[PDB]
Tab-separated table of C-alpha atoms and ligand atoms in Angstrom:
chain	number	residue	atom	x	y	z
A	1	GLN	CA	-80.031	26.323	-12.249
A	2	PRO	CA	-78.346	29.558	-13.535
A	3	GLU	CA	-78.957	32.734	-11.425
A	4	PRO	CA	-81.178	35.335	-13.140
A	5	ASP	CA	-79.777	38.578	-14.671
A	6	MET	CA	-83.347	39.986	-15.020
A	7	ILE	CA	-86.620	39.698	-13.019
A	8	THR	CA	-90.062	41.145	-13.557
A	9	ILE	CA	-91.745	43.071	-10.775
A	10	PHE	CA	-95.449	43.838	-10.455
A	11	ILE	CA	-96.373	47.025	-8.552
A	12	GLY	CA	-100.010	47.627	-7.622
A	13	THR	CA	-101.569	50.580	-5.812
A	14	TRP	CA	-105.241	50.648	-4.800
A	15	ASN	CA	-107.149	52.938	-2.463
A	16	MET	CA	-109.939	50.512	-1.485
A	17	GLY	CA	-112.198	53.295	-0.053
A	18	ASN	CA	-112.749	51.287	3.179
A	19	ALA	CA	-114.794	48.664	1.206
A	20	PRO	CA	-114.083	44.961	0.767
A	21	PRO	CA	-112.905	44.016	-2.718
A	22	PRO	CA	-115.106	42.209	-5.273
A	23	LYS	CA	-114.765	38.415	-5.621
A	24	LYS	CA	-112.463	38.687	-8.708
A	25	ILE	CA	-109.486	41.130	-8.891
A	26	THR	CA	-107.328	39.127	-11.385
A	27	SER	CA	-107.458	41.953	-14.041
A	28	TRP	CA	-105.221	44.011	-11.650
A	29	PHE	CA	-102.438	41.400	-11.481
A	30	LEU	CA	-102.755	40.770	-15.268
A	31	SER	CA	-102.294	44.520	-16.129
A	32	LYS	CA	-105.628	44.610	-18.073
A	33	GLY	CA	-107.863	47.674	-18.497
A	34	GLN	CA	-106.798	51.139	-19.659
A	35	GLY	CA	-103.319	52.564	-20.396
A	36	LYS	CA	-100.171	50.569	-21.216
A	37	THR	CA	-101.481	46.993	-20.773
A	38	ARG	CA	-99.815	43.576	-20.756
A	39	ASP	CA	-100.065	41.254	-23.787
A	40	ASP	CA	-102.643	38.417	-23.442
A	41	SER	CA	-99.900	35.910	-24.421
A	42	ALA	CA	-98.112	36.665	-21.044
A	43	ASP	CA	-101.186	35.972	-18.825
A	44	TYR	CA	-99.932	32.623	-17.414
A	45	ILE	CA	-96.345	33.841	-16.941
A	46	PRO	CA	-95.859	34.803	-13.278
A	47	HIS	CA	-93.939	37.929	-12.329
A	48	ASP	CA	-90.992	37.144	-10.053
A	49	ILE	CA	-92.111	39.577	-7.300
A	50	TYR	CA	-95.570	41.150	-6.677
A	51	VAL	CA	-95.671	44.270	-4.459
A	52	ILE	CA	-99.231	45.300	-3.468
A	53	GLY	CA	-99.845	48.725	-1.846
A	54	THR	CA	-103.281	49.527	-0.461
A	55	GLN	CA	-104.756	52.618	1.184
A	56	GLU	CA	-108.060	52.847	3.064
A	57	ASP	CA	-107.736	49.016	3.334
A	58	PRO	CA	-110.516	47.658	5.620
A	59	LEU	CA	-109.217	44.032	5.680
A	60	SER	CA	-107.036	42.225	8.221
A	61	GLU	CA	-103.597	41.167	6.941
A	62	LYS	CA	-104.860	37.570	6.968
A	63	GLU	CA	-108.030	38.394	4.925
A	64	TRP	CA	-106.003	40.320	2.285
A	65	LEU	CA	-103.160	37.706	2.059
A	66	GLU	CA	-105.781	34.983	1.398
A	67	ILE	CA	-107.365	37.058	-1.438
A	68	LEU	CA	-103.982	37.912	-2.999
A	69	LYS	CA	-102.528	34.385	-2.836
A	70	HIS	CA	-105.766	32.747	-4.164
A	71	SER	CA	-105.844	35.369	-7.016
A	72	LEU	CA	-102.218	34.717	-8.103
A	73	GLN	CA	-102.726	30.912	-7.790
A	74	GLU	CA	-105.803	31.163	-10.115
A	75	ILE	CA	-103.785	33.200	-12.702
A	76	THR	CA	-100.444	31.369	-12.634
A	77	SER	CA	-101.017	28.005	-10.801
A	78	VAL	CA	-98.092	29.119	-8.545
A	79	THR	CA	-98.401	29.302	-4.710
A	80	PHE	CA	-96.496	32.512	-3.903
A	81	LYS	CA	-94.388	32.954	-0.743
A	82	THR	CA	-95.015	35.906	1.595
A	83	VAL	CA	-91.781	37.965	1.740
A	84	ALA	CA	-93.189	40.745	3.962
A	85	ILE	CA	-96.388	42.463	5.053
A	86	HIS	CA	-96.533	45.767	6.929
A	87	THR	CA	-99.555	47.900	7.854
A	88	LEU	CA	-99.821	51.426	9.330
A	89	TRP	CA	-103.455	52.246	10.123
A	90	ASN	CA	-105.201	51.465	6.781
A	91	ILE	CA	-101.994	51.746	4.640
A	92	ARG	CA	-100.512	48.341	3.748
A	93	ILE	CA	-97.740	46.785	1.681
A	94	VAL	CA	-97.552	43.049	0.768
A	95	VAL	CA	-94.551	41.501	-1.006
A	96	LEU	CA	-95.057	38.064	-2.586
A	97	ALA	CA	-92.431	36.104	-4.548
A	98	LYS	CA	-92.192	32.862	-6.598
A	99	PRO	CA	-91.111	29.938	-4.332
A	100	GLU	CA	-87.880	29.447	-6.387
A	101	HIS	CA	-86.759	32.912	-5.057
A	102	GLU	CA	-87.106	32.063	-1.350
A	103	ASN	CA	-83.293	31.468	-0.898
A	104	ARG	CA	-82.374	34.444	-3.195
A	105	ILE	CA	-84.210	36.933	-0.876
A	106	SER	CA	-82.518	38.090	2.340
A	107	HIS	CA	-82.144	41.144	4.655
A	108	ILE	CA	-85.927	41.801	4.695
A	109	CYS	CA	-86.733	45.184	6.368
A	110	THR	CA	-90.107	46.892	7.017
A	111	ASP	CA	-90.802	50.344	8.357
A	112	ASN	CA	-93.420	53.107	8.379
A	113	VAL	CA	-93.542	56.895	8.675
A	114	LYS	CA	-96.537	58.821	10.081
A	115	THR	CA	-96.898	62.288	8.423
A	116	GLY	CA	-98.267	65.536	10.002
A	117	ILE	CA	-98.385	67.045	13.572
A	118	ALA	CA	-101.432	66.848	15.985
A	119	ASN	CA	-104.315	67.940	13.584
A	120	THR	CA	-102.513	66.308	10.601
A	121	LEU	CA	-101.086	63.195	12.478
A	122	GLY	CA	-103.645	60.348	12.533
A	123	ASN	CA	-104.059	58.579	9.181
A	124	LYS	CA	-101.542	59.568	6.381
A	125	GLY	CA	-97.977	58.289	5.908
A	126	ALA	CA	-96.098	55.445	4.305
A	127	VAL	CA	-95.085	51.837	4.722
A	128	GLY	CA	-92.069	50.246	3.102
A	129	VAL	CA	-90.179	47.037	2.479
A	130	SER	CA	-86.588	46.389	1.428
A	131	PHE	CA	-84.580	43.232	0.780
A	132	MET	CA	-81.688	41.831	-1.232
A	133	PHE	CA	-82.435	39.726	-4.277
A	134	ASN	CA	-79.038	37.991	-4.711
A	135	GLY	CA	-76.569	40.908	-5.270
A	136	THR	CA	-79.323	43.536	-5.932
A	137	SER	CA	-81.012	45.747	-3.303
A	138	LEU	CA	-84.733	46.441	-3.815
A	139	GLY	CA	-86.886	49.012	-1.973
A	140	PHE	CA	-90.626	49.613	-2.096
A	141	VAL	CA	-92.607	52.517	-0.600
A	142	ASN	CA	-96.425	52.705	-0.449
A	143	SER	CA	-97.531	56.182	0.657
A	144	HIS	CA	-100.946	57.767	1.233
A	145	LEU	CA	-100.262	61.515	1.111
A	146	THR	CA	-102.404	64.467	2.223
A	147	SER	CA	-105.676	64.857	0.240
A	148	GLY	CA	-107.231	67.984	-1.271
A	149	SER	CA	-106.531	69.961	-4.435
A	150	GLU	CA	-105.134	72.978	-2.438
A	151	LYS	CA	-102.576	70.870	-0.436
A	152	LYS	CA	-99.860	70.073	-3.026
A	153	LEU	CA	-97.235	71.733	-0.746
A	154	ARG	CA	-98.328	69.447	2.181
A	155	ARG	CA	-97.963	66.416	-0.137
A	156	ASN	CA	-94.409	67.576	-1.043
A	157	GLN	CA	-93.638	67.956	2.694
A	158	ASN	CA	-95.099	64.451	3.318
A	159	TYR	CA	-92.746	63.071	0.583
A	160	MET	CA	-89.667	64.690	2.212
A	161	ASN	CA	-90.625	63.358	5.715
A	162	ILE	CA	-91.081	59.835	4.290
A	163	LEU	CA	-87.710	59.785	2.421
A	164	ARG	CA	-85.885	61.260	5.475
A	165	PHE	CA	-87.369	58.978	8.124
A	166	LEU	CA	-88.194	55.637	6.487
A	167	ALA	CA	-85.475	53.291	7.867
A	168	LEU	CA	-85.064	50.663	5.107
A	169	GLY	CA	-81.940	49.088	3.564
A	170	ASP	CA	-78.383	48.898	4.898
A	171	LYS	CA	-78.061	50.934	8.190
A	172	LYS	CA	-74.257	51.135	7.524
A	173	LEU	CA	-75.146	53.551	4.677
A	174	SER	CA	-75.675	56.182	7.407
A	175	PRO	CA	-75.254	59.341	5.209
A	176	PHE	CA	-77.848	58.089	2.691
A	177	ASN	CA	-81.644	58.218	2.685
A	178	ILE	CA	-83.846	55.644	0.896
A	179	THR	CA	-83.373	57.575	-2.449
A	180	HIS	CA	-79.713	56.281	-2.517
A	181	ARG	CA	-79.864	52.922	-0.644
A	182	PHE	CA	-81.286	50.651	-3.431
A	183	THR	CA	-80.331	49.427	-6.918
A	184	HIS	CA	-84.069	49.880	-7.670
A	185	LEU	CA	-86.522	51.943	-5.577
A	186	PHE	CA	-90.250	51.891	-6.418
A	187	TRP	CA	-92.470	54.526	-4.796
A	188	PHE	CA	-96.213	54.264	-5.320
A	189	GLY	CA	-99.485	54.952	-3.586
A	190	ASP	CA	-102.378	57.330	-3.362
A	191	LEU	CA	-100.085	60.314	-3.740
A	192	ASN	CA	-103.233	62.492	-4.003
A	193	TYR	CA	-101.957	65.056	-6.538
A	194	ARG	CA	-104.859	66.547	-8.530
A	195	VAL	CA	-105.676	68.030	-11.937
A	196	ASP	CA	-105.484	71.737	-11.001
A	197	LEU	CA	-108.214	73.309	-13.194
A	198	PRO	CA	-111.108	75.600	-12.148
A	199	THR	CA	-114.070	73.853	-10.434
A	200	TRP	CA	-116.348	75.339	-13.172
A	201	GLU	CA	-114.405	73.142	-15.709
A	202	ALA	CA	-115.589	69.812	-14.101
A	203	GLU	CA	-117.926	68.856	-16.987
A	204	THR	CA	-115.299	69.879	-19.614
A	205	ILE	CA	-112.771	67.597	-17.840
A	206	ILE	CA	-115.276	64.699	-17.932
A	207	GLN	CA	-115.892	65.368	-21.683
A	208	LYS	CA	-112.114	65.248	-22.326
A	209	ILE	CA	-111.834	61.920	-20.378
A	210	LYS	CA	-114.688	60.361	-22.439
A	211	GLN	CA	-112.757	61.363	-25.651
A	212	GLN	CA	-109.536	59.840	-24.169
A	213	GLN	CA	-107.913	63.280	-24.658
A	214	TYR	CA	-105.695	63.387	-21.566
A	215	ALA	CA	-103.084	65.969	-22.820
A	216	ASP	CA	-104.863	69.170	-21.630
A	217	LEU	CA	-105.498	67.397	-18.289
A	218	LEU	CA	-101.953	66.008	-17.662
A	219	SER	CA	-100.521	69.529	-18.385
A	220	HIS	CA	-102.353	70.544	-15.099
A	221	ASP	CA	-101.492	67.355	-13.108
A	222	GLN	CA	-99.870	68.619	-9.910
A	223	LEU	CA	-97.378	65.727	-9.622
A	224	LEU	CA	-96.090	66.324	-13.224
A	225	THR	CA	-95.914	70.150	-12.648
A	226	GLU	CA	-94.313	69.868	-9.174
A	227	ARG	CA	-91.772	67.328	-10.546
A	228	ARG	CA	-90.998	69.638	-13.518
A	229	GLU	CA	-90.292	72.515	-11.026
A	230	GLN	CA	-88.080	70.155	-8.884
A	231	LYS	CA	-90.422	70.507	-5.863
A	232	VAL	CA	-90.860	66.749	-5.289
A	233	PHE	CA	-89.651	63.330	-6.526
A	234	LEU	CA	-86.374	64.767	-7.894
A	235	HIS	CA	-84.506	62.080	-9.967
A	236	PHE	CA	-87.522	59.698	-10.062
A	237	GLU	CA	-89.141	58.441	-13.317
A	238	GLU	CA	-92.797	57.790	-14.184
A	239	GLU	CA	-94.122	56.090	-17.326
A	240	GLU	CA	-96.396	58.172	-19.593
A	241	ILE	CA	-100.025	58.129	-18.367
A	242	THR	CA	-102.413	56.833	-21.081
A	243	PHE	CA	-105.308	55.781	-18.744
A	244	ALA	CA	-108.264	57.861	-17.461
A	245	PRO	CA	-108.072	59.578	-14.049
A	246	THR	CA	-108.462	56.915	-11.334
A	247	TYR	CA	-110.417	59.151	-8.862
A	248	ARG	CA	-113.127	59.993	-7.953
A	249	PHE	CA	-115.704	57.424	-9.245
A	250	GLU	CA	-119.213	56.604	-8.105
A	251	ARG	CA	-118.975	53.039	-6.651
A	252	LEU	CA	-120.292	49.925	-8.530
A	253	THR	CA	-119.828	51.552	-11.997
A	254	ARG	CA	-116.930	53.332	-13.799
A	255	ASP	CA	-119.427	55.350	-15.880
A	256	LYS	CA	-119.582	58.402	-13.514
A	257	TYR	CA	-117.052	60.692	-11.823
A	258	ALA	CA	-118.354	61.984	-8.436
A	259	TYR	CA	-116.669	65.400	-8.231
A	260	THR	CA	-119.188	67.797	-6.570
A	261	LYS	CA	-118.612	69.081	-3.005
A	262	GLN	CA	-120.465	67.145	-0.256
A	263	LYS	CA	-120.507	67.274	3.563
A	264	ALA	CA	-118.620	63.940	3.354
A	265	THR	CA	-115.803	65.668	1.328
A	266	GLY	CA	-115.471	68.620	3.747
A	267	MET	CA	-117.241	70.684	1.042
A	268	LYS	CA	-114.234	70.088	-1.290
A	269	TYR	CA	-114.549	69.357	-5.024
A	270	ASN	CA	-112.766	66.227	-6.238
A	271	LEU	CA	-112.170	67.009	-9.927
A	272	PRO	CA	-111.077	63.824	-11.786
A	273	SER	CA	-107.432	63.228	-10.958
A	274	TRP	CA	-104.533	60.800	-11.248
A	275	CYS	CA	-104.244	60.264	-7.473
A	276	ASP	CA	-102.802	56.742	-7.805
A	277	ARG	CA	-99.237	56.521	-9.141
A	278	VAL	CA	-96.104	54.440	-9.523
A	279	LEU	CA	-92.638	56.024	-9.794
A	280	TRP	CA	-89.143	54.561	-9.616
A	281	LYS	CA	-85.490	55.468	-9.257
A	282	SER	CA	-82.736	53.013	-10.189
A	283	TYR	CA	-78.962	53.523	-9.911
A	284	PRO	CA	-77.335	54.818	-13.112
A	285	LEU	CA	-76.888	52.387	-16.049
A	286	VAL	CA	-78.915	49.578	-14.489
A	287	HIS	CA	-81.569	47.929	-16.704
A	288	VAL	CA	-85.095	49.021	-15.738
A	289	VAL	CA	-87.936	49.097	-18.282
A	290	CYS	CA	-91.626	49.757	-17.556
A	291	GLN	CA	-93.656	47.074	-19.463
A	292	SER	CA	-97.140	48.178	-18.220
A	293	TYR	CA	-98.734	51.212	-16.529
A	294	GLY	CA	-102.492	51.452	-16.367
A	295	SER	CA	-105.740	51.089	-14.442
A	296	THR	CA	-108.356	48.349	-14.202
A	297	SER	CA	-111.880	48.946	-15.640
A	298	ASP	CA	-113.739	46.057	-13.891
A	299	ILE	CA	-112.989	46.593	-10.110
A	300	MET	CA	-115.546	49.110	-8.819
A	301	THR	CA	-115.943	48.620	-5.001
A	302	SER	CA	-113.878	51.781	-4.354
A	303	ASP	CA	-114.104	55.412	-5.538
A	304	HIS	CA	-110.549	54.734	-6.862
A	305	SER	CA	-109.582	52.280	-9.587
A	306	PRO	CA	-106.551	50.064	-8.978
A	307	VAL	CA	-103.335	50.997	-10.825
A	308	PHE	CA	-100.738	48.481	-12.035
A	309	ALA	CA	-97.207	48.874	-13.279
A	310	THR	CA	-94.742	46.176	-14.298
A	311	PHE	CA	-91.000	46.364	-14.756
A	312	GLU	CA	-88.046	44.452	-16.133
A	313	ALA	CA	-85.300	44.985	-13.542
A	314	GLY	CA	-81.642	44.013	-13.914
A	315	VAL	CA	-80.241	41.908	-11.048
A	316	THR	CA	-76.773	40.535	-10.281
A	317	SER	CA	-75.597	37.267	-8.669
A	318	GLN	CA	-74.071	36.879	-5.154
A	319	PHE	CA	-70.428	36.878	-6.356
A	320	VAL	CA	-67.728	34.691	-4.671
A	321	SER	CA	-64.035	34.559	-5.769
A	322	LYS	CA	-60.881	32.874	-4.331
A	323	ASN	CA	-60.149	36.296	-2.693
A	324	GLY	CA	-63.211	38.450	-1.831
A	325	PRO	CA	-65.481	38.361	-0.037
A	326	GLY	CA	-63.321	38.354	3.157
A	327	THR	CA	-60.290	40.109	1.626
A	328	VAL	CA	-59.302	42.585	-1.146
A	329	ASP	CA	-58.269	41.570	-4.707
A	330	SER	CA	-54.945	43.375	-5.430
A	331	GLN	CA	-55.799	43.190	-9.217
A	332	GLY	CA	-58.676	45.741	-8.748
A	333	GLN	CA	-58.573	49.509	-8.069
A	334	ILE	CA	-60.703	52.657	-8.517
A	335	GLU	CA	-58.878	55.987	-9.009
A	336	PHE	CA	-60.248	59.582	-9.273
A	337	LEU	CA	-58.628	62.488	-11.192
A	338	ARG	CA	-59.502	66.231	-11.503
A	339	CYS	CA	-62.469	65.813	-9.033
A	340	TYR	CA	-64.456	68.630	-7.450
A	341	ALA	CA	-67.764	69.164	-5.690
A	342	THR	CA	-69.821	72.308	-6.409
A	343	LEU	CA	-72.099	73.102	-3.454
A	344	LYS	CA	-75.065	75.474	-3.098
A	345	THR	CA	-74.347	75.979	0.654
A	346	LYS	CA	-73.831	79.558	1.849
A	347	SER	CA	-71.572	78.189	4.680
A	348	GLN	CA	-67.703	78.293	4.660
A	349	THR	CA	-66.449	75.090	6.496
A	350	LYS	CA	-64.007	72.350	5.312
A	351	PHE	CA	-65.440	69.260	3.543
A	352	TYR	CA	-64.298	65.676	2.969
A	353	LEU	CA	-65.845	62.777	0.984
A	354	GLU	CA	-67.040	59.346	2.066
A	355	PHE	CA	-67.148	56.487	-0.497
A	356	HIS	CA	-69.654	53.676	0.302
A	357	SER	CA	-70.113	50.505	-1.798
A	358	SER	CA	-70.755	46.763	-1.268
A	359	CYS	CA	-67.620	46.301	-3.520
A	360	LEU	CA	-65.503	47.739	-0.571
A	361	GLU	CA	-64.762	46.001	2.774
A	362	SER	CA	-65.945	49.235	4.427
A	363	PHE	CA	-66.534	52.918	3.623
A	364	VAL	CA	-63.558	55.200	2.850
A	365	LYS	CA	-63.020	58.762	4.128
A	366	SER	CA	-60.999	61.177	1.956
A	367	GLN	CA	-58.744	64.054	3.095
A	368	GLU	CA	-60.346	67.516	3.185
A	369	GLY	CA	-60.779	69.264	-0.152
A	370	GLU	CA	-59.635	72.833	-0.859
A	371	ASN	CA	-62.432	75.408	-0.986
A	372	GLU	CA	-62.476	78.006	-3.811
A	373	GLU	CA	-65.130	80.569	-4.950
A	374	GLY	CA	-66.981	79.725	-8.251
A	375	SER	CA	-67.348	82.551	-10.868
A	376	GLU	CA	-71.148	82.779	-10.147
A	377	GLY	CA	-70.837	82.742	-6.283
A	378	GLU	CA	-70.740	78.874	-5.790
A	379	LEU	CA	-68.602	77.000	-3.233
A	380	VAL	CA	-66.207	74.715	-5.217
A	381	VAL	CA	-64.495	72.010	-3.138
A	382	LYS	CA	-61.402	70.883	-5.065
A	383	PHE	CA	-60.076	67.355	-4.511
A	384	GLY	CA	-57.767	67.522	-7.610
A	385	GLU	CA	-55.725	64.250	-7.552
A	386	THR	CA	-55.954	63.863	-3.721
A	387	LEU	CA	-58.826	61.262	-3.429
A	388	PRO	CA	-57.828	57.779	-2.228
A	389	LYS	CA	-57.317	54.685	-4.386
A	390	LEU	CA	-60.325	52.394	-3.619
A	391	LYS	CA	-59.592	48.667	-3.210
A	392	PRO	CA	-62.524	46.500	-4.298
A	393	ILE	CA	-63.072	43.025	-2.729
A	394	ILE	CA	-63.369	41.381	-6.209
A	395	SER	CA	-61.451	42.461	-9.396
A	396	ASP	CA	-63.392	40.302	-11.906
A	397	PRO	CA	-64.868	42.799	-14.451
A	398	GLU	CA	-68.121	40.750	-14.662
A	399	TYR	CA	-68.637	41.784	-11.017
A	400	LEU	CA	-66.918	45.174	-10.711
A	401	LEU	CA	-68.461	46.887	-13.819
A	402	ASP	CA	-71.969	46.159	-12.321
A	403	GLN	CA	-71.184	48.019	-9.045
A	404	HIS	CA	-71.831	51.590	-7.863
A	405	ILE	CA	-70.046	54.033	-5.519
A	406	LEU	CA	-72.217	56.200	-3.245
A	407	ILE	CA	-70.556	59.554	-2.419
A	408	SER	CA	-71.335	61.808	0.540
A	409	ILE	CA	-69.661	65.204	1.003
A	410	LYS	CA	-69.448	65.867	4.758
A	411	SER	CA	-68.612	68.913	6.888
A	412	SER	CA	-65.335	68.410	8.866
A	413	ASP	CA	-66.851	70.549	11.721
A	414	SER	CA	-70.145	68.580	12.128
A	415	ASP	CA	-69.627	65.296	10.133
A	416	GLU	CA	-73.158	66.028	8.658
A	417	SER	CA	-73.672	65.200	4.919
A	418	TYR	CA	-74.297	68.247	2.679
A	419	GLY	CA	-74.883	66.115	-0.423
A	420	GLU	CA	-75.226	62.522	-1.564
A	421	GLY	CA	-74.839	60.995	-5.024
A	422	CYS	CA	-73.998	57.812	-6.915
A	423	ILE	CA	-71.442	56.858	-9.618
A	424	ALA	CA	-71.832	53.760	-11.879
A	425	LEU	CA	-68.730	51.598	-12.590
A	426	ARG	CA	-70.421	50.477	-15.881
A	427	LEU	CA	-67.679	52.294	-17.843
A	428	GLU	CA	-67.039	52.418	-21.583
A	429	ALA	CA	-63.411	51.369	-20.886
A	430	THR	CA	-61.075	50.140	-18.129
A	431	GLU	CA	-57.573	51.497	-17.400
A	432	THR	CA	-58.835	54.722	-19.168
A	433	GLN	CA	-59.595	58.203	-17.677
A	434	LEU	CA	-63.313	58.807	-18.225
A	435	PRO	CA	-65.615	61.644	-17.108
A	436	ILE	CA	-67.875	60.936	-14.073
A	437	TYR	CA	-70.737	63.042	-12.757
A	438	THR	CA	-73.527	62.854	-10.187
A	439	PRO	CA	-75.931	65.467	-8.861
A	440	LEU	CA	-75.751	65.797	-5.060
A	441	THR	CA	-78.929	65.876	-2.928
A	442	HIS	CA	-79.697	66.167	0.791
A	443	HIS	CA	-83.163	65.225	2.068
A	444	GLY	CA	-83.877	64.643	-1.647
A	445	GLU	CA	-83.276	68.355	-2.568
A	446	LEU	CA	-80.502	69.388	-5.000
A	447	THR	CA	-77.501	70.688	-3.012
A	448	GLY	CA	-74.678	70.482	-5.543
A	449	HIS	CA	-72.755	68.370	-8.031
A	450	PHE	CA	-69.720	66.081	-8.052
A	451	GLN	CA	-67.640	65.638	-11.201
A	452	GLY	CA	-64.193	64.529	-12.278
A	453	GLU	CA	-62.594	61.537	-13.917
A	454	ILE	CA	-62.411	57.880	-12.948
A	455	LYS	CA	-59.857	55.186	-13.926
A	456	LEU	CA	-61.004	51.599	-13.193
A	457	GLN	CA	-58.609	48.619	-13.152
A	458	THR	CA	-60.180	45.118	-13.276
A	459	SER	CA	-58.448	41.707	-13.565
A	460	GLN	CA	-58.917	42.017	-17.395
B	1	WO7	C1	-100.564	26.647	-18.479
B	1	WO7	C2	-100.828	27.368	-17.160
B	1	WO7	O1	-99.917	27.509	-16.412
B	1	WO7	N1	-102.161	27.869	-16.834
B	1	WO7	C3	-102.309	28.545	-15.547
B	1	WO7	C4	-103.769	28.838	-15.163
B	1	WO7	C5	-104.634	27.602	-14.874
B	1	WO7	N2	-105.215	26.956	-16.040
B	1	WO7	C6	-104.259	26.803	-17.109
B	1	WO7	C7	-103.221	27.646	-17.819
């Protein structure tokens, strides 16, 4: 049996509105309804991994696992294995995989983050799962962010607390948050961003939805506008939305949006909105292709419709040579020329780099760079030709060109990271000086840039 170089991943998000689901939810897992839907000819083909995020989920873990497994068995005739299940309050994530993958999946982690303080701590936050699939790290975050059209800033704060504090993936990657720990990171949920139009425009919005004219609505979608202004989800992708707003429906039909203010809404309007979303971030030059992104039309127990997204995702094998793992391969090396970090920090302290990668026996600390002033006020940390020669564990180009180097720039005084980034070794050429570049972030905010040249030697 050859190891896969691609898998398909199903992501679902559903706010169940504290109601049990209907007896049939197969349309969700088949990516049928509105938007970018899956071809009928694929219906019996199982995805490799199914990741199900719920919010306002009234079921026990056992009740929901039985419904999910029985659903997938009906569709595919496959009995899926439970990889992980984690619940915080009424926020839940389930990971299911094809039985053939049981011995390809390892290092399973779960965690949660509770968002808000006192008033605002009690029901919002995130759950997450990570694991290795052979040589590829996968992370999954299901978040239920703050509700209400006038709380987009709170939602952005909730996002930053989740990416700082969710403890998934390799704990040896200590400088890096979840936005750098995974080959592929999927973040989904009831993110609760709204279409930010006047209340008086409610009936116009409904009209536009009935005409399937989403353009004038998406131009006011708070997640798209906040992402365009770099306020949230920096360096994440989302497929184009071609399905109707998934909130807020009258239950037991999809024919009516319930938007008017009620005691039960805290006298808030719920204009039709794309509350329920799937986003991703993969390391540079890894295969990831969205093959579906849409909402179901036939599941109506909740005031939200379920959302599905499916992906092709590149994966690598668990590589063994005569040498590494357990030693270096003298035939491999990674060199860096003309490198410098540009930092937004107003501070004047010395900096050094740390290089982290599963292609190294352990992380590598550089010497301090030389600080200079940029011509527009910036701090420029020059490394010139001073960065170490990195010694990978395996020199085979079929392995090494698929790897990535995480970079942190750290203060000498405090050893705190000021910026994190990632460089692909998927180069156009080996033994050749080539430009490299990554933005640097800290707590998911842009803090600088790292650029220079790389020269990669493989056994070929
Ligand atoms: C061929 C196949 O795998 N299927 C799965 C669903 C059950 N009935 C038949 C079709």
